[PDB]
Every structure is written in structure tokens, then in C-alpha cells.
Amino acid sequence: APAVDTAEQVYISSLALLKMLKHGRAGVPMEVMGLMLGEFVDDYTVRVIDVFAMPQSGTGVSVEAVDPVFQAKMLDMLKQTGRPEMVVGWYHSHPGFGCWLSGVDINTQQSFEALSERAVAVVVDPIQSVKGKV
Amino acid sequence: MVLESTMVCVDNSEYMRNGDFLPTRLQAQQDAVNIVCHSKTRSNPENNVGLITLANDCEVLTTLTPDTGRILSKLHTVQPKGKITFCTGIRVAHLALKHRQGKNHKMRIIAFVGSPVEDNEKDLVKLAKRLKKEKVNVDIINFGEEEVNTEKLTAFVNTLNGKDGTGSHLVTVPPGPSLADALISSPILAGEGGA
Amino acid sequence: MKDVPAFLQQSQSSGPGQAAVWHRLEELYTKKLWHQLTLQVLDFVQDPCFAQGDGLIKLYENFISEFEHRVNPLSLVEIILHVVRQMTDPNVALTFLEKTREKVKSSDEAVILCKTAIGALKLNIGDLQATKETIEDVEEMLNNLPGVTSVHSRFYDLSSKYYQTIGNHASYYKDALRFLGCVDIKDLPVSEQQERAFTLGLAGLLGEGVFNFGELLMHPVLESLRNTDRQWLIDTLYAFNSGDVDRFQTLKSAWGQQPDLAANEAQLLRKIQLLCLMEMTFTRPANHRQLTFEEIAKSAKITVNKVELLVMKALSVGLVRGSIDEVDKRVHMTWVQPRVLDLQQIKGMKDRLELWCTDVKSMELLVEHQAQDILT
Amino acid sequence: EQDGIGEEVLKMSTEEIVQRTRLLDSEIKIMKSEVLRVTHELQAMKDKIKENSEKIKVNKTL
């Protein structure tokens, strides 16, 4: 809705930024994805603290990868450590597509949105992490 | 038991070497611990169970988990030349509360005392009074201490018990043959509230 | 029961007023007081005069066979060792030790004890070869655990005994070193240690190229051990440790009491000097490292012609590395061999570290003071 | 296995064998508890394998 949806300028920490670049890089052309742990303050500030990743596949991002089981499983670990984090959004890497969101990537983003209203979608370019511009 | 996270203590003592609990009390304790896991789940299924050895420079074998399989893997290695240190195991349950699964659950320790207490009585009576305010109570299963001397452990439990919302009890199972099955007598069904 | 009580009654009957001790064992088993049973056996085997006799041998055999989980093998294993020294027949003994080694209650270290004990038995009988193979196997098993203090040390003494029997002193001294690191007085008889320590002390000196005198000072096993002969012998080791030709050699009259030292007296005096090249260069000069020949020469009270030749042997062993310049009358050390902790040594290192700290602070100010524009 | 040999006669008394029988009753029940643990270990290893299998499956097809 135009009356409550505003963009989320993401403050990305060292732990998230490095994690995402490395994970995509090794998998190539197998694409990796995951949920992002962080905290949400303001009506627009998201700090991305840390990430864990979902199943890689040789077709890359798909509906099959996204299951509530992985997420639910993680949350139980979050309690046990005594970490508080709610889910800020999700990430993926596209070596096999550009920054444009692929047809399977939108499907995957819609599911993740149902769980956290404020959801962000990130393209990582693992390939570019080899060169000095990322 | 019912929305409670518990740490279960198994004895390491020289007294475990006895034939009174067949074949040996060390091996018997494995049967006992699985009774404690199974009983707690039976009453309500919403609780967690852990296992600590007080062997050597006290090591947590396994932390709070609903899984009986995890506890049982860890129990087979044990120090049969060790000795029970009652005082240190309480300390391990204190640390556990800050960061555990079931953070918001209640606090209880169920302890076996299969051998006399090693840690000075006075220190322990006094320890109980601090423990009442944080709201963790200790329930002691006594069959080792009673043979030698009068129950010191009784004093500890008395002072401890107040308002906590969880209670404590001294349960006595006999020092002679009764096998592991004696664990039924314990507050793993006999437990009550403090509030 | 008539488990262990049946054999035990036969034994109990024959001893005098030792019967009462025997009766305790029989009840504690019957009650199912296996923990009290474990302690009981250890006290029990010491007291009876019947024990040295055949009834006890037979009793331990029935005891072990019957119990591998009733009571632990570790207490029974300890019992068989006390008996096995008493016997007049080692052949039969050897056989019995092995017999006991069967199963385990839970985990008890008892397996190794039997193996070490068979090694001890072999050595006396005169089967050296056999002693050796078993010694090699146990040595690994013991070493692995941090929990073995005492057991590993008796085993190590046992290997030194085999080397000593041959009479080859060089080999003996080396093997003995592994014992010196492992040493502890507890559970190691006062007497085996005593004989070994006196022999060793003599042994190192006789060697052609073995030097660990500094190590010997460190351990109380050779140091605290003293006898008439021993007072002079430790003073000779001390002389050696510091690296003084002159102290060592003055002692010569005493040496004669031992003829071993007297045969290879020649070798002994040359060796101190060979050491001196290494000792003098690391200790006294920070600033220089070169030594004159003439110093050795007077000290040894050995001619000039010989020292040049002795110095050459010194370099070949590797106590010192360097070059010799004859025409300058110096032997220059590029390097000095590491040496085990010595009394002189520790003092020099501290002195040199102090000189070093002070220079580095002075120098730091110079380096910082100049080149201002790059210094950020 | 161990019993029903003539060697057993020599080594041990009869009383040792009957007492060993009494210990056995408790020992079997414990072994039954151990059944539950072994199954539990087997599933944990498998789960790692299951994760691995998802990846192998897609490549194998078209």
C-alpha cells in the first residue's frame, strides 16, 4: 500500500557482508540463498547483523529450497543461545542471472514476506567479489 | 515435569562400585536416567532434561534437550574413581538459566546422592537461601548419605523451600537392593509447587 | 556363598589369628558390598605369613577368574604383583601373571600392569630378549594417558636394567635419561633407584661423546643419593657441569676407588676440555665468542701440540661449529650447541637480556628522533 | 558362550556362575534402553547426508 510501505535502507555489518560474498563464490554456478537475521527499528532502519544460508541447487533459486522447516529450526537455535533476532528479510546470489529478480526469485520473496511484513531482497554477485569492485 | 527445565546429576563415587544395585550402580544409573526422562515427559510434554557429570574438573556432558538419546550417549563415559560434588552441580544449573533452550521455563535441579556429601554442610545451607530468591529449588534423592550419617541434605531442602513456584522434597529410597526402578519414588511424579 | 569363601576357608584355617582378616573378605562379597570388597584385598595380602606360601597363589587365581566385573581387575592385579616378588620360582610366576589378564569391569588400567610385571619377571630369569619386546609395547600404551604417573616410571626403570646387564655403558646412559625425565619416587622402590643412580653416575663419565651432566644436578634421584663413594662422584659431576677442566682433574685421587674411571682416566680428562670449548664461549663473553688455545692448555695441564688436535675433535662432534685460525692462535665459534640447564648458564642469559633491553630503548629514541616528515 | 566348557569347572565355583545369572537380569534391561540411543545416533548422521542428497538429485536429471 502507498500508505505504509517505504523502503528499507539497509545497514550491513561486516559479519553479513563477508558471509554472503563467500558463500555465493564457492557454490558458482550453483546459487545459494538464506534468511537474514537482524533487527528492525524506525519505520525504515534495518540493520543486517548476520545471515545463515538455505540449500544450494544446480538450478539455483527455487520454491523447493524455501521451506518453513529450515527457518523454524533456526529459531529454536536462537532461543537456546539467547540471541533475540527476528527475520529482517532474505538474500540470494545470482552469478547465473543479473541484478534483475528472476521469475523464481519473486515467488520465493512472496513467501518470505508473509512471515515478516518488512522483508528485504538482496542480489549478491559472487563473481565480482574476485575483482576489486563489488 | 511441567514447564520446567531440569538438570539431572549422576554420581561418580567409589560407592557406585557396590553390587547392591545389580550388577553395578554405575551401569544402573543409565537405566535410572532414562526413567527420569520418560517420567517427566509423561506428566506433561513441555519440559526438558539434561545430564551433568561431576567427574573430574566438572564437565557438562549434555545441556537441555528433550531427547533421551543425547543424554544416554554421554553417560557411558564416567569416572568410577571420582566422587560426587553436590555444590558444583547447582552452579552449573545457575549458569544454564541465562542461555538455555526454554529460557522462560522454571528452574529445578534433581540430583542423585548415591554417596555421602563432600561439600561442607554449612556452605550449602547458606547457598539455599540465595537460591530461593532466584527461584531454583533442589530435590535430593538420598540413599547413599543416610547409611553413614543422618540426612544433612534435609536442612538444605527446608531452608530452600519458600515461594519459588517450584518446590523441593527429600525422597528416600533404601540403600539396599531396589535396582534403578526406585527412581519412580522421586519428585519426577511426586513434585509439588512453592507458590 | 562358597564362591570366593570356599577357597578362602582353606587358607583361613591354616593361618594363625590371620583367620579373622580372612573372614572379612568372605562376608563383604556375600552382602554385595563390592566397593568394600575392593579396598579389603589390598590391606589383606600384606599381613599373612601364609601369603608367601602356595595357598595365596592358588587363591588369587580363583579370585581373578571368578571376578572380572564383581570387582575390578585393577585391585586383583595389584595383589598378584605383591605375591610375585615373594616366590622362589620365577618360571611358574610368569605364567600366572599372564593368566590373570582377561576382561575388565568397565574401564580399569589393569591390562598394562600385567604387561609391565611380565617384563620385570623376564629380566631376573635371564630371558633378556623377551623382556625387550614387551617393554617396547607397553611404553607406547602408558605414554598416551596424562593419568599415568607412577606406572610409566617403573616401566622405564625396567628398560634401563636390560641395558646395564650387557655392560655396554654408552647405551645404558641414554636409556637412563628417559627414566630421569619420568622420575617420581612414589610407587618406585627406594632400593632399585639407589643402585641405578650410582651406576648411572659412573656411566655418563665413561662415555666418549654423551653430555647431560646439567640434567643430573636437576633431579634429586642421583643428587640426594649419597654414600661414601658417592660424595666424591657427585663433586666430579659438578666439576663437569660448569665446564672446568681444573676442578675435575684435581679430584683424580678419588677416582681410583672405582677402577672403571681409572682405565679410561685418559679419555675422561680430554673430554672435559672438549666440553670447555662449548662452555666457555656461551657463558663468559657476550661481546666476543673467540677463544685462545693457551687457555685450555694451562687448564688441562696438557701440551700445546695436543690442544690444537683436541679442538679439531670438538668441532667434529658438534659441540662447537666455527673455523680455527692457527696463525692468530684462536678458535672462533660461529655457534655453540644447546645444553641442558646448567648453573652458570641461567645467569649469563639474564645478563645479556638486560644489556639487550637497555640498547633497544636507547636506539628507539634515535630512530624516532630523526626522519620527522615520514614518521606518521 | 563362555559357559558349558569343561575349563569353566576348574576356574570357577558353581556359586560364581549362579550369581553371574542374577547380574544378567538387570544387564539385559539396560541393553534394551540402549536400543533407543542407537537409533537416535543413526538419524543424526543421516540428516547431514539428507542435506547432501538434495544437491545430487537435481544434477542427475536434465
PDB file of C-alpha atoms in Angstrom, chain A residues 11-20 48-50:
ATOM      1  CA  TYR A  11      22.908  -1.070   7.334  1.00  0.00           C
ATOM      2  CA  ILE A  12      25.045  -4.064   6.568  1.00  0.00           C
ATOM      3  CA  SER A  13      27.657  -5.242   9.109  1.00  0.00           C
ATOM      4  CA  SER A  14      30.899  -6.930   8.486  1.00  0.00           C
ATOM      5  CA  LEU A  15      29.585 -10.360   9.602  1.00  0.00           C
ATOM      6  CA  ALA A  16      26.758 -10.307   6.987  1.00  0.00           C
ATOM      7  CA  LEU A  17      28.581  -8.690   4.130  1.00  0.00           C
ATOM      8  CA  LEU A  18      31.574 -11.093   4.139  1.00  0.00           C
ATOM      9  CA  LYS A  19      29.357 -14.157   4.699  1.00  0.00           C
ATOM     10  CA  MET A  20      27.157 -13.573   1.725  1.00  0.00           C
ATOM     11  CA  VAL A  48      21.512  -6.819   8.904  1.00  0.00           C
ATOM     12  CA  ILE A  49      23.548  -8.437  11.797  1.00  0.00           C
ATOM     13  CA  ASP A  50      24.206 -11.900  10.446  1.00  0.00           C
TER      14      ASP A  50
END
